[PDB]
Amino acid sequence: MSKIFDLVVIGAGSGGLEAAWNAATLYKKRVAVIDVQMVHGPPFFSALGGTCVNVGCVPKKLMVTGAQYMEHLRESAGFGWEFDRTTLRAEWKNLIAVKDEAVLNINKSYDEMFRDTEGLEFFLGWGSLESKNVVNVRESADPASAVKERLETEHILLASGSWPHMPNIPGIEHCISSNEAFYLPEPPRRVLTVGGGFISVEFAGIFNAYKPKDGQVTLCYRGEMILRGFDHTLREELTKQLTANGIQILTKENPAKVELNADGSKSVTFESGKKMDFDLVMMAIGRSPRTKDLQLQNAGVMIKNGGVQVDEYSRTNVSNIYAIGDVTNRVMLTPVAINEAAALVDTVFGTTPRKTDHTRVASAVFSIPPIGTCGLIEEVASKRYEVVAVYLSSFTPLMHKVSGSKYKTFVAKIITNHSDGTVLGVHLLGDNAPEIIQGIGICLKLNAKISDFYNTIGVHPTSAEELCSMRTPSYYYVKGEKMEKP
Amino acid sequence: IFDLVVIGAGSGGLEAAWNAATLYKKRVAVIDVQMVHGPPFFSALGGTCVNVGCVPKKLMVTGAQYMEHLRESAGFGWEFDRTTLRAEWKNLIAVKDEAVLNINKSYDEMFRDTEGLEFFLGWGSLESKNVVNVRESADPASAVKERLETEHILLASGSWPHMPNIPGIEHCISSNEAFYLPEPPRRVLTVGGGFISVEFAGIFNAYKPKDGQVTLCYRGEMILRGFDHTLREELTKQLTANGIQILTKENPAKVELNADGSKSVTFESGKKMDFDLVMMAIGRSPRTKDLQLQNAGVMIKNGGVQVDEYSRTNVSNIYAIGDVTNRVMLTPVAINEAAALVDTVFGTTPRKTDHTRVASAVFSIPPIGTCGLIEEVASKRYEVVAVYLSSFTPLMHKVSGSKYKTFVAKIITNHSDGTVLGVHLLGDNAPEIIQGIGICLKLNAKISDFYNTIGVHPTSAEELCSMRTPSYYYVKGEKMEKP
Ligand SMILES: Cc1cc2nc3c(=O)[nH]c(=O)nc-3n(C[C@H](O)[C@H](O)[C@H](O)COP(=O)(O)OP(=O)(O)OC[C@H]3O[C@@H](n4cnc5c(N)ncnc54)[C@H](O)[C@@H]3O)c2cc1C
Ligand SMILES: Cc1cc2nc3c(=O)[nH]c(=O)nc-3n(C[C@H](O)[C@H](O)[C@H](O)COP(=O)(O)OP(=O)(O)OC[C@H]3O[C@@H](n4cnc5c(N)ncnc54)[C@H](O)[C@@H]3O)c2cc1C
Ligand SMILES: N[C@@H](CCC(=O)N[C@@H](CS)C(=O)NCC(=O)NCCCCNCCCNC(=O)CNC(=O)[C@H](CS)NC(=O)CC[C@H](N)C(=O)O)C(=O)O
Ligand SMILES: N[C@@H](CCC(=O)N[C@@H](CS)C(=O)NCC(=O)NCCCCNCCCNC(=O)CNC(=O)[C@H](CS)NC(=O)CC[C@H](N)C(=O)O)C(=O)O
């Protein structure tokens, strides 16, 4: 009918590409997708493929895999492997080179995708709303920039994702974000990662494996302990294991200002009065939805706390305008953005409405060692349930008894609704935790009870079999009070 | 005098003896031929898994896996003088002996500190349905060290390697000796397509000297019979790619020790090859003879003791669990049967072991994880079967250099209702991934339960949540595809 496109997707990331693909393919709709760059890298960092591909999950997993070899090389000795350890060295530029080729290939893959799909078209530029049914494509983020294209459409989808949050403190311009970290030419000998979240924790491990001769990695966090939002036992254990591998963790510390010393070094003064020197300061304190450049007021789309407000079906307060992924500020993860996009396309161009359950979402932290988690943490469950039970198990994995890494304790924790045995959450710390948690993610979707876990025969020998060996709770939570059996 | 007498202090035996004395306060006597691992009897207090099974082989597979990491590290910028690389078989053996020895001790410690639990060193045999004798040897004419009268007897003698009757079999070893070799063989021949043969081939392949070679031969057409055909084909390609030599439809006829101390092996086809070590891993059989079972009249069916779903034999007060029953020879299963037996005998609730949908792994390089039925079976028990396949080179293997390491995930379902009949995996961490899905099958999950779960990204396991369209089906045993 009138309006050239059926759907206009602003942002070619995880959710955008999924949305765009389904509508053109499954429903035969003419879709236009817009993004700022064709390939990864400065100046805009993300490009076709989104954050996960260009400056997220893909590159960090390869870099984390590389860091892990430091562990492998050191531990091989416990099993009789010999070599002249004095010739060992990590070549950072090689890592960056292979990472760049891996991402570039994905960028190309998405490009040919458009070239081979009828009804799917890509537009290079910055998209913004002129009105609720007209999207402009400009040369730059500036709203007074030249208009390259003007797309009339029947439906609009906002999938601009997020961007790192730089705190307004003196000297912030001497700091970088995770964005620049992917393109460093050399690894910093002295680096400070500001933040207690997963990005900060993951990069600290990367920097720890590739740091030069007299290097030191320092992580600092404002609060009491790292990984706020995760199970307290795992937060405590990971802190010990990271420290044991040479990472200095400064909690209860908060920068006041960053000064650039004449020798190119940065001096950081904390509110405590403590002053330290680093070669690189990286801010990984949070990510914010990118709503700014969209010009949402031209359509009257409502923004709640930072992100675009949407209902359960990803619909905004304005008809024919939807938003998915990180810009909605729900659960900032790739698999969730993809699930929302596919559900949204079904609700809009399909027969049956559909929505994404944002509960019992399994996720991981690729720290060294890594974390896997699904469900509620006891602190939250105990406030929602009158009777909660906590099953805990800590042991040294077989290989680490002889590998030398005595400190690598594997922690398994299952929390349940004691009134009926329903498993509310599973939290793991230890090697392969991210691979083990996927399968249990399905179990919670099936509303499994603790009895269901221990009535399954285990695979011997593996770390995973321990989840099927927890029959008795360690302590309980009765109306928020911690209690035990005498 | 004792409430229960357990013949065999292994995975199942110790499990029964423990909670019977604990949970039911019964006086238990446990018998075993050796207290520490190694020659002469190899197995000892703790059983096969602990002494010459799961525990020691797992440490050795971890050791062999480092050949992969050392090589693959180069792809991520790790460099070192690769010409100075050498593997030390004796350090590997030294550390595993330590680890095993500490576990043997841990069990001895257990008996002293547990009231009503007593260990008797030696060989146990039935004198009568209520009398058990502990002699100094497997030969029933040896000195009776102890005589015990009990109202309950539990048989858990386990299994033992099956050495074929061929000329020269005295120049061959079994998996038992493998754990104690002083130096790694230059040329080794592993006979058998089973898991023990495949796992050891990967261990020998990693610790082989300078100009070494590992050969695996199997009578059949393809290794790992009983496993999913795709995994069998794919694993073969990957073992071969790593330098392992696989000879299918070959079987040794005779083994002649020759001059220099090597062995000349002549296969049934006429092929003749020399090896420095020949390991026979063709089978495991229940140890029932030394029990003098006819002294009580307990039935034997096919090598193993005949028992019902509740592990009771034909004689009222005698039960049998574990490998000796020839059901499913795995440690977790034996442990489950033990606890269920103890309940059915000293408890209010009769309880039995579900031998179906048990997950298991093969610690080969790369490993295998599996749970449920294979399509060859499912299409015979079901009229409409759907097969979902996913093959892909993981992210890290694109960059590590090991581009041949293809990850395979296969899901088999009963297409009439979507119920998942089996999940088979090949690839790094397959053993860890399969455990969680093992629970899913006990909960009777359907394929929709898998693809409706949000994945963990990036991981190999999320691929199981992205399979939603069948590759092909099986209609009344016939393979069919949608047009
Ligand atoms: C360092 C890091 C590590 C991460 N690791 C993980 C992990 O391992 N697992 C996981 O699940 N998630 C991880 N994430 C998060 C994951 O990347 C995001 O949740 C996911 O990318 C969100 O998908 P999306 O569709 O919302 O947005 P995106 O993929 O971010 O796509 C948004 C797109 O919008 C484009 N754009 C922005 N504004 C405009 C405009 N006005 N006009 C045109 N184009 C525009 C951007 O260039 C970008 O390509 C990580 C994130 C970071 C940064
Ligand atoms: C090389 C190898 C690798 C394996 N790997 C795995 C694996 O990774 N995972 C897995 O689940 N399973 C594995 N298994 C199988 C597993 O070890 C057995 O299934 C398990 O040990 C069986 O427990 P059980 O109690 O039935 O026997 P056992 O552990 O075999 O205990 C039997 C005990 O009886 C004793 N004995 C025998 N006869 C007498 C007698 N008359 N008097 C006194 N003592 C006697 C023996 O000395 C032995 O200690 C492996 C086995 C082998 C050989
Ligand atoms: N929940 C996702 C899981 C896989 C995933 O994250 N896929 C991303 C790719 S990064 C994706 O497809 N996002 C949306 C999208 O692109 N939709 C359009 C449909 C076509 C899909 N892509 C076509 C182009 C082909 N290349 C890629 O998609 C490149 N992707 C990858 O390389 C991703 C990393 S983001 N692989 C995986 O995450 C696989 C896991 C890996 N094998 C491991 O072992 O770790 C899903 O269900 O698809
Ligand atoms: N989960 C499987 C069974 C796993 C298993 O084989 N467990 C063995 C432990 S060796 C066992 O307990 N067998 C029976 C038994 O021992 N019964 C007697 C009563 C309880 C006390 N037994 C333990 C004595 C102390 N020493 C050890 O337990 C030393 N064990 C280990 O080191 C074992 C290997 S057999 N680790 C595990 O079994 C756990 C896995 C390992 N941590 C990993 O990293 O993968 C199942 O039942 O489904």
Side-chain angles (χ1 to χ4, degrees):
Chain A
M1 272 271 66
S2 309
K3 292 161 174 187
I4 53 180
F5 287 99
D6 291 289
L7 180 63
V8 177
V9 185
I10 295 177
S14 308
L17 290 179
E18 189 69 19
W21 175 259
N22 285 23
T25 295
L26 283 55
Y27 293 111
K28 308 302 299 183
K29 299 285 149 47
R30 190 183 177 214
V31 185
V33 184
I34 308 162
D35 210 298
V36 306
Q37 298 188 158
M38 288 293 289
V39 301
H40 68 105
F44 308 138
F45 298 99
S46 50
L48 189 48
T51 306
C52 186
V53 171
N54 299 283
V55 286
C57 342
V58 178
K60 78 91 182 294
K61 181 65 180 298
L62 291 181
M63 295 169 79
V64 171
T65 298
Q68 179 58 52
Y69 283 108
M70 181 179 79
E71 307 301 286
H72 292 324
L73 293 174
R74 194 189 105 236
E75 297 171 344
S76 61
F79 299 80
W81 289 89
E82 294 182 49
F83 69 97
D84 187 35
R85 284 188 170 84
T86 42
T87 54
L88 185 56
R89 66 126 77 146
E91 184 63 63
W92 175 261
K93 191 50 60 61
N94 185 311
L95 175 69
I96 301 305
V98 305
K99 180 271 295 180
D100 285 1
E101 281 145 348
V103 178
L104 177 52
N105 295 151
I106 301 167
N107 294 140
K108 291 178 180 176
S109 174
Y110 284 124
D111 179 42
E112 68 167 21
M113 175 183 100
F114 281 85
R115 200 191 65 229
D116 300 343
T117 305
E118 219 305 299
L120 198 56
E121 289 170 51
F122 181 81
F123 297 81
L124 191 72
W126 295 77
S128 59
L129 286 61
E130 185 181 90
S131 57
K132 63 178 298 181
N133 62 355
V134 178
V135 177
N136 293 146
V137 183
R138 294 180 166 115
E139 289 281 14
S140 73
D142 179 55
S145 199
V147 176
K148 308 176 66 166
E149 293 282 9
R150 188 167 170 286
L151 312 316
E152 294 189 319
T153 185
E154 189 167 346
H155 295 93
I156 294 174
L157 177 66
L158 311 169
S160 45
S162 53
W163 197 244
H165 175 62
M166 290 292 98
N168 188 12
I169 63 173
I172 192 55
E173 74 282 335
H174 301 313
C175 310
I176 67 169
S177 64
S178 56
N179 284 150
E180 292 77 12
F182 290 113
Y183 299 90
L184 294 174
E186 289 188 336
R189 60 172 290 258
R190 291 172 302 182
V191 59
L192 173 71
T193 53
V194 183
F198 79 96
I199 287 170
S200 186
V201 169
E202 288 170 1
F203 266 99
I206 288 174
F207 292 139
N208 188 226
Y210 288 85
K211 84 297 193 179
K213 38 61 178 63
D214 307 304
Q216 187 61 198
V217 178
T218 302
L219 176 311
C220 72
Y221 176 44
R222 193 163 65 171
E224 281 207 52
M225 199 165 266
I226 59 172
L227 292 181
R228 162 190 162 70
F230 286 80
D231 183 85
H232 70 113
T233 310
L234 281 44
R235 299 170 63 187
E236 300 177 55
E237 269 304 321
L238 186 56
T239 300
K240 298 180 185 183
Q241 301 184 37
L242 286 174
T243 308
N245 203 31
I247 296 173
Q248 184 189 31
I249 297 178
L250 297 174
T251 45
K252 287 282 181 55
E253 293 301 337
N254 186 23
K257 57 173 184 175
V258 182
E259 309 176 307
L260 182 60
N261 298 135
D263 67 312
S265 305
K266 290 83 178 179
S267 191
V268 182
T269 312
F270 299 88
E271 291 290 359
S272 62
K274 177 199 288 287
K275 183 184 288 279
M276 286 173 80
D277 267 44
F278 306 99
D279 300 276
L280 188 283
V281 178
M282 182 191 103
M283 291 282 144
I285 63 162
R287 290 179 63 77
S288 313
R290 294 172 91 166
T291 49
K292 179 192 296 293
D293 307 311
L294 288 58
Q295 299 303 303
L296 298 187
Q297 74 286 355
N298 294 346
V301 180
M302 240 190 288
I303 44 180
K304 189 53 182 61
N305 289 143
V308 183
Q309 72 152 199
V310 293
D311 59 20
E312 306 168 286
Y313 300 78
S314 300
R315 303 186 205 96
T316 68
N317 65 294
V318 177
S319 75
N320 296 345
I321 301 186
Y322 326 97
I324 53 80
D326 296 3
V327 78
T328 59
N329 208 351
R330 292 142 121 174
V331 182
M332 302 199 351
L333 297 174
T334 288
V336 174
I338 288 171
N339 191 248
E340 291 169 348
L344 181 276
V345 168
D346 287 335
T347 301
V348 178
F349 301 113
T351 40
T352 55
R354 181 183 158 215
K355 59 184 173 188
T356 296
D357 177 17
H358 293 90
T359 69
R360 292 109 87 218
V361 174
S363 57
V365 180
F366 295 91
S367 39
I368 300 176
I371 290 180
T373 183
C374 186
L376 307 173
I377 60 173
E378 56 194 61
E379 296 96 322
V380 177
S382 57
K383 300 307 171 183
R384 300 186 183 194
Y385 301 89
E386 184 160 80
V387 194
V388 171
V390 178
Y391 301 72
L392 170 56
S393 201
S394 308
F395 58 98
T396 310
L398 186 45
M399 67 169 286
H400 288 306
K401 292 166 170 168
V402 300
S403 82
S405 303
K406 300 295 197 306
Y407 59 90
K408 292 182 176 174
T409 305
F410 189 105
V411 183
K413 198 165 178 188
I414 308 182
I415 84 101
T416 61
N417 167 3
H418 198 49
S419 297
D420 65 344
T422 296
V423 184
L424 280 31
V426 182
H427 315 281
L428 319 169
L429 173 61
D431 293 323
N432 305 130
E435 295 294 346
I436 302 166
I437 207 71
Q438 179 67 91
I440 82 90
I442 303 175
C443 290
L444 267 70
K445 210 65 193 303
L446 296 171
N447 295 302
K449 309 191 189 310
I450 188 64
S451 47
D452 289 317
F453 281 42
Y454 57 65
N455 287 324
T456 297
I457 290 173
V459 186
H460 189 61
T462 58
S463 290
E465 70 178 328
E466 287 302 309
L467 279 35
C468 303
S469 305
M470 293 180 250
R471 298 182 169 92
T472 302
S474 313
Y475 58 89
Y476 315 68
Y477 275 109
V478 174
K479 298 194 68 63
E481 308 163 278
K482 180 185 171 305
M483 283 181 225
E484 301 178 306
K485 276 195 150 184
Chain B
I1 59 178
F2 280 101
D3 289 75
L4 177 68
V5 178
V6 177
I7 295 178
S11 305
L14 288 171
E15 181 70 10
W18 173 259
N19 54 83
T22 288
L23 307 182
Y24 299 96
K25 301 296 296 181
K26 300 296 177 179
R27 196 175 177 245
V28 178
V30 195
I31 307 171
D32 214 285
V33 311
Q34 211 170 258
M35 293 193 87
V36 173
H37 66 103
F41 307 147
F42 291 111
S43 192
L45 192 56
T48 309
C49 182
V50 171
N51 296 291
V52 289
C54 348
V55 178
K57 78 91 182 293
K58 186 57 187 288
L59 292 176
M60 292 160 86
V61 173
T62 302
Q65 178 61 229
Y66 288 106
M67 176 170 92
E68 308 303 290
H69 300 313
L70 299 186
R71 188 186 125 224
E72 295 173 346
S73 66
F76 297 82
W78 290 92
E79 53 169 89
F80 65 93
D81 198 3
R82 288 185 158 99
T83 51
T84 60
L85 192 58
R86 57 184 298 225
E88 276 301 304
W89 176 262
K90 188 49 63 186
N91 193 20
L92 174 72
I93 298 294
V95 307
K96 81 107 170 82
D97 279 332
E98 196 65 77
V100 181
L101 184 268
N102 296 155
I103 298 173
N104 292 138
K105 287 179 172 179
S106 185
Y107 284 115
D108 181 36
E109 189 168 292
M110 178 188 105
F111 285 93
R112 304 178 297 99
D113 313 325
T114 301
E115 185 221 320
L117 187 63
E118 294 173 54
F119 179 62
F120 290 109
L121 185 71
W123 299 75
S125 353
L126 302 184
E127 186 198 277
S128 73
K129 51 171 290 165
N130 301 280
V131 186
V132 177
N133 289 118
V134 184
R135 296 184 183 292
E136 304 178 15
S137 180
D139 167 47
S142 51
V144 168
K145 313 179 68 177
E146 222 72 71
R147 182 180 167 287
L148 310 76
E149 36 248 303
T150 185
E151 193 226 313
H152 298 300
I153 303 173
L154 182 68
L155 310 171
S157 42
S159 53
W160 200 249
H162 170 70
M163 297 300 262
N165 174 47
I166 63 169
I169 189 61
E170 63 274 354
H171 302 127
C172 305
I173 60 169
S174 63
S175 46
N176 290 149
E177 290 75 17
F179 291 111
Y180 300 93
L181 297 174
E183 280 200 69
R186 181 197 186 299
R187 301 153 173 138
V188 62
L189 173 70
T190 213
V191 181
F195 83 94
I196 290 173
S197 197
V198 179
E199 292 175 354
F200 269 99
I203 296 175
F204 290 140
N205 181 236
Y207 290 83
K208 72 187 184 302
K210 181 191 171 182
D211 305 294
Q213 180 60 61
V214 173
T215 308
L216 175 316
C217 68
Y218 177 47
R219 166 185 261 102
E221 305 191 79
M222 193 155 64
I223 60 176
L224 288 182
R225 176 185 165 208
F227 288 78
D228 176 46
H229 79 100
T230 302
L231 307 190
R232 297 169 70 193
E233 296 169 20
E234 211 52 58
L235 181 63
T236 296
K237 296 177 186 172
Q238 301 182 35
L239 292 178
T240 295
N242 209 9
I244 298 177
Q245 179 183 218
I246 303 177
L247 273 26
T248 38
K249 295 208 297 176
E250 289 297 341
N251 193 41
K254 64 172 181 184
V255 186
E256 304 177 290
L257 175 56
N258 69 268
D260 59 287
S262 54
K263 296 84 200 299
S264 188
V265 176
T266 306
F267 304 88
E268 292 178 16
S269 59
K271 294 192 63 181
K272 194 182 292 282
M273 278 184 255
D274 291 278
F275 295 102
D276 300 300
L277 184 76
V278 180
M279 188 187 97
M280 288 285 166
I282 62 172
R284 300 277 299 173
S285 341
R287 308 178 72 169
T288 47
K289 67 180 175 184
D290 304 336
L291 301 182
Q292 309 307 330
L293 297 176
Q294 75 297 126
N295 289 188
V298 309
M299 270 297 285
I300 297 296
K301 189 59 181 61
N302 248 291
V305 181
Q306 184 179 64
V307 295
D308 59 5
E309 285 202 88
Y310 292 93
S311 294
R312 303 189 206 92
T313 65
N314 61 318
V315 182
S316 55
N317 68 323
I318 304 177
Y319 327 102
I321 53 84
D323 292 3
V324 81
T325 58
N326 209 350
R327 291 145 133 169
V328 188
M329 302 193 295
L330 297 169
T331 285
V333 174
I335 283 177
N336 198 265
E337 292 173 342
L341 181 282
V342 171
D343 285 25
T344 304
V345 175
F346 308 107
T348 43
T349 51
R351 201 220 298 169
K352 55 173 181 180
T353 300
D354 185 349
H355 293 98
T356 59
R357 296 165 296 159
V358 179
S360 53
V362 183
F363 290 94
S364 43
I365 301 178
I368 288 182
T370 188
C371 185
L373 285 25
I374 61 177
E375 68 199 72
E376 292 74 21
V377 170
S379 55
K380 308 311 168 188
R381 303 182 183 190
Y382 300 86
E383 180 175 86
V384 192
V385 171
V387 176
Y388 302 70
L389 179 62
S390 191
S391 309
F392 62 97
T393 312
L395 192 60
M396 79 167 283
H397 288 315
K398 291 273 193 169
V399 305
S400 67
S402 321
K403 289 187 182 63
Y404 58 96
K405 299 197 186 183
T406 304
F407 189 102
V408 179
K410 173 180 292 183
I411 300 183
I412 312 298
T413 61
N414 173 0
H415 194 51
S416 306
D417 58 5
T419 301
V420 181
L421 300 184
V423 184
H424 315 279
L425 310 171
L426 177 66
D428 292 305
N429 295 120
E432 296 290 347
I433 299 170
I434 201 71
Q435 183 63 89
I437 76 87
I439 301 175
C440 288
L441 276 62
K442 293 298 290 287
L443 290 166
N444 300 117
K446 293 170 172 54
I447 186 64
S448 58
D449 296 293
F450 283 46
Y451 60 73
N452 278 307
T453 293
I454 295 173
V456 181
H457 173 75
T459 57
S460 287
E462 69 177 315
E463 295 305 314
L464 273 37
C465 298
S466 307
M467 290 181 246
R468 48 191 71 224
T469 305
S471 303
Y472 59 95
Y473 308 73
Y474 278 110
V475 184
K476 270 259 183 286
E478 307 167 88
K479 174 182 163 186
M480 281 171 42
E481 297 188 290
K482 298 228 298 181

PDB file of all heavy atoms in Angstrom, chain A residues 416-428:
ATOM      1  N   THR A 416      16.352 -23.807  46.131  1.00  0.00           N
ATOM      2  CA  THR A 416      15.010 -24.250  45.776  1.00  0.00           C
ATOM      3  C   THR A 416      13.931 -23.669  46.687  1.00  0.00           C
ATOM      4  O   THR A 416      14.213 -23.115  47.754  1.00  0.00           O
ATOM      5  CB  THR A 416      14.871 -25.782  45.963  1.00  0.00           C
ATOM      6  OG1 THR A 416      15.111 -26.098  47.352  1.00  0.00           O
ATOM      7  CG2 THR A 416      15.885 -26.531  45.134  1.00  0.00           C
ATOM      8  N   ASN A 417      12.683 -23.806  46.251  1.00  0.00           N
ATOM      9  CA  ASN A 417      11.502 -23.402  46.998  1.00  0.00           C
ATOM     10  C   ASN A 417      11.245 -24.643  47.843  1.00  0.00           C
ATOM     11  O   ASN A 417      10.652 -25.610  47.359  1.00  0.00           O
ATOM     12  CB  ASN A 417      10.325 -23.177  46.065  1.00  0.00           C
ATOM     13  CG  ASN A 417       8.971 -23.057  46.788  1.00  0.00           C
ATOM     14  OD1 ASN A 417       8.900 -23.087  48.020  1.00  0.00           O
ATOM     15  ND2 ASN A 417       7.900 -22.943  46.016  1.00  0.00           N
ATOM     16  N   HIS A 418      11.703 -24.622  49.069  1.00  0.00           N
ATOM     17  CA  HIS A 418      11.563 -25.757  49.969  1.00  0.00           C
ATOM     18  C   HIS A 418      10.134 -26.282  50.105  1.00  0.00           C
ATOM     19  O   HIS A 418       9.977 -27.479  50.336  1.00  0.00           O
ATOM     20  CB  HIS A 418      12.164 -25.393  51.335  1.00  0.00           C
ATOM     21  CG  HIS A 418      12.469 -26.568  52.213  1.00  0.00           C
ATOM     22  ND1 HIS A 418      13.166 -27.675  51.773  1.00  0.00           N
ATOM     23  CD2 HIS A 418      12.221 -26.780  53.529  1.00  0.00           C
ATOM     24  CE1 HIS A 418      13.338 -28.515  52.780  1.00  0.00           C
ATOM     25  NE2 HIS A 418      12.773 -27.995  53.856  1.00  0.00           N
ATOM     26  N   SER A 419       9.114 -25.424  49.917  1.00  0.00           N
ATOM     27  CA  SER A 419       7.747 -25.925  50.043  1.00  0.00           C
ATOM     28  C   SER A 419       7.384 -27.013  49.031  1.00  0.00           C
ATOM     29  O   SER A 419       6.536 -27.851  49.340  1.00  0.00           O
ATOM     30  CB  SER A 419       6.742 -24.783  49.971  1.00  0.00           C
ATOM     31  OG  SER A 419       6.919 -23.882  51.054  1.00  0.00           O
ATOM     32  N   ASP A 420       7.997 -26.990  47.824  1.00  0.00           N
ATOM     33  CA  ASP A 420       7.663 -28.044  46.865  1.00  0.00           C
ATOM     34  C   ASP A 420       8.883 -28.613  46.140  1.00  0.00           C
ATOM     35  O   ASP A 420       8.752 -29.475  45.272  1.00  0.00           O
ATOM     36  CB  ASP A 420       6.631 -27.552  45.845  1.00  0.00           C
ATOM     37  CG  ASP A 420       7.034 -26.451  44.892  1.00  0.00           C
ATOM     38  OD1 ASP A 420       8.047 -25.787  45.138  1.00  0.00           O
ATOM     39  OD2 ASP A 420       6.329 -26.260  43.906  1.00  0.00           O
ATOM     40  N   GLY A 421      10.063 -28.118  46.491  1.00  0.00           N
ATOM     41  CA  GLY A 421      11.286 -28.601  45.879  1.00  0.00           C
ATOM     42  C   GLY A 421      11.675 -27.994  44.542  1.00  0.00           C
ATOM     43  O   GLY A 421      12.693 -28.392  43.969  1.00  0.00           O
ATOM     44  N   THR A 422      10.885 -27.027  44.034  1.00  0.00           N
ATOM     45  CA  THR A 422      11.161 -26.361  42.759  1.00  0.00           C
ATOM     46  C   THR A 422      12.507 -25.638  42.774  1.00  0.00           C
ATOM     47  O   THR A 422      12.771 -24.851  43.682  1.00  0.00           O
ATOM     48  CB  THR A 422      10.040 -25.340  42.457  1.00  0.00           C
ATOM     49  OG1 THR A 422       8.846 -26.083  42.291  1.00  0.00           O
ATOM     50  CG2 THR A 422      10.321 -24.558  41.164  1.00  0.00           C
ATOM     51  N   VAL A 423      13.361 -25.930  41.781  1.00  0.00           N
ATOM     52  CA  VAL A 423      14.681 -25.315  41.652  1.00  0.00           C
ATOM     53  C   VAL A 423      14.503 -23.882  41.144  1.00  0.00           C
ATOM     54  O   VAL A 423      13.946 -23.657  40.066  1.00  0.00           O
ATOM     55  CB  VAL A 423      15.556 -26.190  40.700  1.00  0.00           C
ATOM     56  CG1 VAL A 423      16.968 -25.649  40.620  1.00  0.00           C
ATOM     57  CG2 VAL A 423      15.702 -27.584  41.250  1.00  0.00           C
ATOM     58  N   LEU A 424      14.933 -22.919  41.948  1.00  0.00           N
ATOM     59  CA  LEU A 424      14.825 -21.500  41.609  1.00  0.00           C
ATOM     60  C   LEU A 424      16.091 -20.932  40.970  1.00  0.00           C
ATOM     61  O   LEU A 424      16.027 -19.905  40.291  1.00  0.00           O
ATOM     62  CB  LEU A 424      14.449 -20.662  42.869  1.00  0.00           C
ATOM     63  CG  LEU A 424      13.050 -20.494  43.492  1.00  0.00           C
ATOM     64  CD1 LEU A 424      12.190 -21.708  43.286  1.00  0.00           C
ATOM     65  CD2 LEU A 424      13.235 -20.113  44.959  1.00  0.00           C
ATOM     66  N   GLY A 425      17.227 -21.569  41.204  1.00  0.00           N
ATOM     67  CA  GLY A 425      18.465 -21.095  40.623  1.00  0.00           C
ATOM     68  C   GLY A 425      19.601 -22.066  40.838  1.00  0.00           C
ATOM     69  O   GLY A 425      19.604 -22.802  41.822  1.00  0.00           O
ATOM     70  N   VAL A 426      20.542 -22.096  39.889  1.00  0.00           N
ATOM     71  CA  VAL A 426      21.749 -22.918  39.847  1.00  0.00           C
ATOM     72  C   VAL A 426      22.890 -21.955  39.519  1.00  0.00           C
ATOM     73  O   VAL A 426      22.774 -21.166  38.579  1.00  0.00           O
ATOM     74  CB  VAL A 426      21.523 -24.032  38.809  1.00  0.00           C
ATOM     75  CG1 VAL A 426      22.719 -24.955  38.753  1.00  0.00           C
ATOM     76  CG2 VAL A 426      20.330 -24.883  39.201  1.00  0.00           C
ATOM     77  N   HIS A 427      23.963 -21.980  40.323  1.00  0.00           N
ATOM     78  CA  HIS A 427      25.105 -21.082  40.160  1.00  0.00           C
ATOM     79  C   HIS A 427      26.413 -21.865  40.256  1.00  0.00           C
ATOM     80  O   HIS A 427      26.644 -22.556  41.245  1.00  0.00           O
ATOM     81  CB  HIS A 427      25.036 -19.997  41.237  1.00  0.00           C
ATOM     82  CG  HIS A 427      23.666 -19.409  41.397  1.00  0.00           C
ATOM     83  ND1 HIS A 427      23.160 -18.454  40.542  1.00  0.00           N
ATOM     84  CD2 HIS A 427      22.661 -19.718  42.251  1.00  0.00           C
ATOM     85  CE1 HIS A 427      21.901 -18.203  40.857  1.00  0.00           C
ATOM     86  NE2 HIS A 427      21.575 -18.958  41.890  1.00  0.00           N
ATOM     87  N   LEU A 428      27.270 -21.736  39.237  1.00  0.00           N
ATOM     88  CA  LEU A 428      28.531 -22.473  39.191  1.00  0.00           C
ATOM     89  C   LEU A 428      29.762 -21.597  38.975  1.00  0.00           C
ATOM     90  O   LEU A 428      29.701 -20.565  38.306  1.00  0.00           O
ATOM     91  CB  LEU A 428      28.477 -23.487  38.048  1.00  0.00           C
ATOM     92  CG  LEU A 428      27.223 -24.276  37.803  1.00  0.00           C
ATOM     93  CD1 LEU A 428      27.310 -24.996  36.496  1.00  0.00           C
ATOM     94  CD2 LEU A 428      26.989 -25.208  38.963  1.00  0.00           C
TER      95      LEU A 428
END
